[PDB]
Structures are given as C-alpha cells and as structure tokens.
C-alpha cells in the first residue's frame, strides 16, 4: 500500500508537466501567427518598384513584429519553469513509483 500512496504522489507531477506544455503551446501559436505576418511584410518590401517612403514603413513594421515575437517568447513561463525560452535542455517528470522519469526535451522557440 505504500506504493499506491507513491502513485498518488506521481500523478500531480504528470499534471504539472501537462500545464507547462499548454502554456508553451499558447505562446507558440501566437509566435507562428507573428511569423506569418512577418513573412508577408518582407515579401511586400522585396519589391523594386516601391517608393522610398514605403520601404521604411514596411521595415518598421517588421521590426515591431520581431520585438513582439521576442516578448511573446520570453513570457511563457509556468511556475518559473518553461520549455520555450531556452533556459534548460530538458525537463524530467515522475513516471514510476520508484523514481524512473518521463523525459521531455526542450524546444526553444
């Protein structure tokens, strides 16, 4: 029965891992949308028939969107630990009542 109590201890760690990955996924969706918009801006600015005063506007839009991606990426922490900023190489959660782990590598975005 001691082992059943330990399983009760394991389930919370599994749930916490789920939560961190959800936060990362939300930030990632925002980042992918921003990247699409940045591609659109760069494609529009690649035109050689463009005026000198529109190129600057498109460049400033690009720069704003890049700063946005950076902010959106560094804010995606749950409980101080995150798998999208690039702070650590992997996160290991509990998976067995004897200590063996569930490994989740880090996917910096």
């Amino acid at each position: 029965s001691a082992t059943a109590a330990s399983m009760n201890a394991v389930k919370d760690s599994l749930q916490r891992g789920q939560s961190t990955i959800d936060v990362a996924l939300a930030a990632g969706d925002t980042i992918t949308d921003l990247l699409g918009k940045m591609k659109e801006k760069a494609l529009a600015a690649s035109d050689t028939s463009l005026n000198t005063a529109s190129f600057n506007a498109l460049k400033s839009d690009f720069d704003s969107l890049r700063d946005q991606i950076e902010k959106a990426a560094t804010n995606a922490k749950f409980n101080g630990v995150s798998i999208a900023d690039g702070s650590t190489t992997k996160l290991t959660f509990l998976a067995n009542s004897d200590g063996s782990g569930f490994t989740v590598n880090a996917k910096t975005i």
Binding site: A26, A27, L34, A57, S60, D61, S64, D67, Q68
Partner: protein, 55 residues
C-alpha cells in the same frame, strides 16, 4: 504638434517666392507626420497582441 513636425507656428509666406519653399516645407511636414502616425499604429497593435497573450 507644429513644433514637432518642424512647421514653426507664426510662419507664413510674405511674397510669391516664399511659397515656393513653403511647398517643400509642407511636403516634408506631411511625410514625417505620417511616419510618426504609422509608428503609433504599430505600437497599438503590439499592445493588443500582448494583452491577448497575458489573458
């Protein structure tokens, strides 16, 4: 404001020759004003995006 875009309040054209340069002054003023407003719009969009993420 008038100082910000370089217009300079109480700045007119007394003869038919100062207008030839006032044309260019107003062109530069309009350009820089539109640039500043574009930057403001970009910043507003950024605020909206970050608010969504905070939610």
């Amino acid at each position: 404001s008038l100082a910000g875009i370089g217009l300079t309040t109480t700045s007119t054209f007394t003869t038919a020759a100062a207008a030839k340069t006032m044309i260019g002054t107003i062109d530069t003023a309009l350009q820089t004003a539109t640039n500043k407003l574009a930057s403001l719009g970009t910043s507003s969009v950024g605020l909206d995006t970050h608010l969504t993420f905070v939610g």
